[PDB]
Amino acid sequence: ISGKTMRGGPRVPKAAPYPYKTKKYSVFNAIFDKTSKRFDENSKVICVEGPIAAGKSKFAKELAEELDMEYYPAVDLDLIYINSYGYDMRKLDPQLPPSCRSYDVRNFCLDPSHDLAAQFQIRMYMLRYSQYIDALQHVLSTGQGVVLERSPYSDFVFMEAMFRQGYLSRGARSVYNELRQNTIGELLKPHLVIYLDLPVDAVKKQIKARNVDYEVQSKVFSDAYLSDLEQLYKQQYLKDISTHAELLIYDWTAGGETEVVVEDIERIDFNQFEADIHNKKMLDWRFPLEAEWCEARIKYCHEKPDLMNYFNVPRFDVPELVRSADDGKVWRDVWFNAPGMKYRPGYNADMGDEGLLTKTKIGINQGI
Amino acid sequence: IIKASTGLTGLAVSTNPHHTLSALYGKILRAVSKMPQDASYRKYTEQLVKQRADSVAQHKDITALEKAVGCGQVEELIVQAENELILARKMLGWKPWEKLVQAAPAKQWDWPPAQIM
Amino acid sequence: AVQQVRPILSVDREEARKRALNLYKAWYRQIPYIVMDYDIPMTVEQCRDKLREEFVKHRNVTDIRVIDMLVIKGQMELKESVEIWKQKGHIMRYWKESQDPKPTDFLSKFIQGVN
Amino acid sequence: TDGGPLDPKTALARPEELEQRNKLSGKITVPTAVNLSPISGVPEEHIRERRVRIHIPPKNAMQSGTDNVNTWQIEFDNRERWENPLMGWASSGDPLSNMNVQFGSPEEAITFCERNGWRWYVDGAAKPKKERVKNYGINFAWNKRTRVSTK
Ligand SMILES: Nc1nc2c(ncn2[C@H]2C[C@H](O)[C@@H](COP(=O)(O)OP(=O)(O)OP(=O)(O)O)O2)c(=O)[nH]1
């Protein structure tokens, strides 16, 4: 993956980028537009990794700037608590039942032993899923690679970290394992992963480098929990990914510099895995025909409601993930009658949208 | 202006040899800067890679760089710089600058060995 | 006396004993596949008795490096018996099926020959 | 240390694997008396039957040179040789009858025989040197019986 300096300037595309957010790509659109006419050496998925506090955002933004890639930060719960109109839904909690109240990252940090925190972990996985297809829509349709601050593959370690600390039961672990077995097999594993290795204590020191109140007055950021994440990462997750992705582990006790991390990438030969068609490295990203490339692009553009509807699994034995029916009706009549989500986010007259009388357009892969 | 082939299989031509050489030389300096100053290997590697970095920075043409260095073609210079970077990463852990790890045993390096003396 | 040497695959005697027992388990599993494949005139029970005798004549050693060298050599013979890598003439070499036994009493040794 | 890419087979390894590699990189305490008879591949009959003689080789009495005397050597006991009935050569069933192993001191040969488990013995020790005075004036002497009658 050539950087900005070896290329001699900004990256030029091999063909015209497809407007994937505006034009729907389907089977009948696959004849005129072909997927592999845009792919190059820069069209790879790079996922940066690491512990709780490792400077992933600034390093990933600098890696996106130097390699001419699209930056995708880690998804937080302000994507669904704050809708497209800017109204935060964390102010609806007096009217909501206590089993249906808002629960975000700071609510996990203040109250770790809450039931809905397990739901929160499951919710976070869905949000990571909700960006990963948005990663794979960007690589396949435009031909420019992406960088991800965290991965949907990188989220079961958080589940096991809550489970070994006692914040989750066996039932929520079994539920999240069933959703992971149901959903992760439809994704393509990333091309390259960068893990920023840190000790258990130094991350805590980096907590004091952040000075936010809800992460310093909390209880979860202890010696056993961060050691549990470090053990889970380096003993299960990275060893499972290194059979597919070229793993790069750096020590980040110091500040570090993104240029040497860029310069280690071009020393990797990515064409040595194409000699064997049954090689485990880059197995999900090789396609022998142009029609298989268009088949994957159709699966990742026209079948994103398919992959989001694969989460509809029934699990009723747990009492932490089952919403009460009276509480569900009260939640519906508060949440869907709130300003900003009475209708579909295009057609909402209460938030100043004009020209609704002649408008019949809807968003492609849009949450209703 | 580009080389058609190196005349040597397994090594393709390099699009930007100068930046690859300069990055490898900077990484060799970063690996050798952690060595102690009393070690002679650090001084020898610093002298080598400073001379090679001045040769890369002084010459902009590829074949002029290959003539000025004089070791060989520039892809083999990239190979040599990568090998010395691997060495400079390894010798921090191998710790060579200290004293002898094992003393000489009696009659270990004597030839002919069968004598009484 | 005392000597500081580099170890071979084990630090103390317990790990070397565990490796010898792993050899015995692997040779026990490998004997019924040796019998049915190599075309040798030895019953499975005779093969296990010969394996027991081969371990018995090396019970007497005490040094852990000698024990681990024996473990390495036994693992080499196991790897030469998992893959066939050999013939039936070399498998029967443990039994010494061609050598006629010699007497141990001094009168028969005096009668037969000076050896 | 260096801020480059770390080695993946050491960072991702389990703590039991880091303990396993560091214990084999150390130094263990062993006795210096080591019996290596089952390792050397010698048959057990030659171990329990053969006797090993450590000796300085004899000087050839017809030759004044002592360069071949200047080493010690290990040799094995002479077994039965016989005449083959076909043609008359000297057949021998002894594989170790032709091996002389050179050594510097008898202590080295004794430790080598204790290493290989042979039944060793030393035939003779190192020869002490007696100071003998030799000069030409004794040959022509006055009232002495050492006056030479030759020349
Ligand atoms: N309960 C829970 N908390 C999570 C999860 N993923 C991230 N967090 C929380 C833990 C910390 O409060 C916070 C740290 O976020 P990250 O580790 O993604 O990095 P951060 O946002 O600090 O960015 P940075 O690495 O400093 O650039 O996010 C998860 O799956 N479950």
Q: Are A136 and A188 in contact (CB under 8 A)?
A: yes
Interface check for A258 against chain D (CB to CB < 8 A): the answer is no
Phi, psi of A81 (to 5 degrees): -80, -30
* Cβ(A158) – ligand 1 distance below 6 Å: yes
CA distance C93 to A30: 70
DSSP SS3 for D102: strand
Which atom in ligand 1 lies closest to the alpha carbon of residue A54?
A: 25
Please give the single-letter amino acid code of residue D119: R
A52, A104, A312, A101: which is closest to A208 by C-alpha?
A: A52
Quote the ligand 1 centre to A75 CA distance (angstroms).
10
Q: Where are the alpha helices (DSSP H) in A169-289?
A: 170-183, 200-207, 213-216, 223-232, 238-241, 258-263
On whether the CB atoms of residues D57 and D68 are closer than 8 A, the answer is yes
Distances from the Cα of A9 to the Cα of A17, A40, A258, angstroms? 19, 16, 18
Cβ(A57) – ligand 1 distance below 6 Å: yes
* Residue A88 phi, psi (nearest 5): -75, 130
CA of A52 to the centre of ligand 1 (A): 5
DSSP D146: T
Give, for D29, the enclosing helix (H) or strand (E). Answer: strand D28-30
| Selected residue of A40, A263, A269 to mutate for chain B interface (largest B Cβ count, 10 A) | A263
DSSP D59-94: PPTT----STTSSEEEEE----EEE-TTT--EEE--
DSSP H helices, chain B, are: 17-32, 40-58, 62-69, 74-94
State whether residue A66 sits within 8 Å of chain B by CB: no
Contact (Cβ atoms closer than 8 angstroms) between residue A13 and residue A38: yes
Quick one: which atom of ligand 1 is closest to the CA of A57?
A: 27
- The answer to whether D104 and D88 are in contact (CB under 8 A) is no
- D5 with A239: Cβ contact below 8 A: no
Q: How is chain C classified by DSSP, letter by letter?
A: --EEE--SS-SSHHHHHHHHHHHHHHHHHHHHHHHHHHT-S--HHHHHHHHHHHHHTTTT---HHHHHHHHHHHHHHHHHHHS--S-HHHHGGGTT-SSPP---SHHHHHHH---
User: Three-state DSSP class for A167?
Assistant: coil
**How many Cα atoms occupy the beta-carbon half-sphere of A309 within 13 Å?**
8
D143 by DSSP, 3-state: which? coil
Beta bridge partners of D30: C3
* Distance from the B115 Cα atom to the nearest Cα atom in chain D, whole angstroms: 5
Q: Write down the experimental method used for this entry.
A: cryo-EM
For a mutational test of ligand 1's pocket, the pick from A48, A49, A52, A106, i.e. the residue with the most ligand atoms closer than 8 A to its C-beta, is A52
Q: Are A195 and A38 in contact (CB under 8 A)?
A: no
* Residue A204 beta carbon below 6 angstroms from any ligand 1 atom: no
Whether D4 and A264 lie within 8 Å, measured CB to CB: yes
Q: What's the CA gap between A271 and A289, in Å, rounded?
A: 17
Which ligand 1 atom is nearest residue A109's CA?
A: 12
Query: How far is residue D103's CA from residue C73's CA, in Å, rounded to a whole number?
Result: 29
Ligand 1 pocket, residue A155 CB under 6 Å: yes
Give the distance from residue B19's alpha carbon to the nearest chain A alpha carbon, in angstroms: 7
- Ligand 1 contacts CB of residue A60 (under 6 A): no
Residues contacting residue C88 through CB under 8 Å, at least 6 positions apart: C38, C39, C40
Residues 6 or more apart in contact with residue A210 via CB below 8 angstroms: A53
Q: Residue A357 carries which DSSP code?
A: T
* Dist CA A175 CA A162 (whole Å): 14
DSSP E strands, chain A: 45-48, 70-72, 146-148, 192-197, 246-251
Resolution (A): 3.4
Distance CA D93, CA D75 (A): 16
Cross-strand partners of A194:
A48, A248
Cβ neighbour number for residue A53 with a 10 Å cutoff: 19
B→A contacts (Cβ < 8 Å), by residue, are 15-16, 19-20, 23, 26-27, 30, 82
Find tokens 């991965």 and name the residue. A151
Segment (H or E) for A108: helix A105-110
User: What is the position in ligand 1's atom list of the atom closest to the CA of A162?
Assistant: 1
Check CB contact under 8 Å for A5 and B19: yes
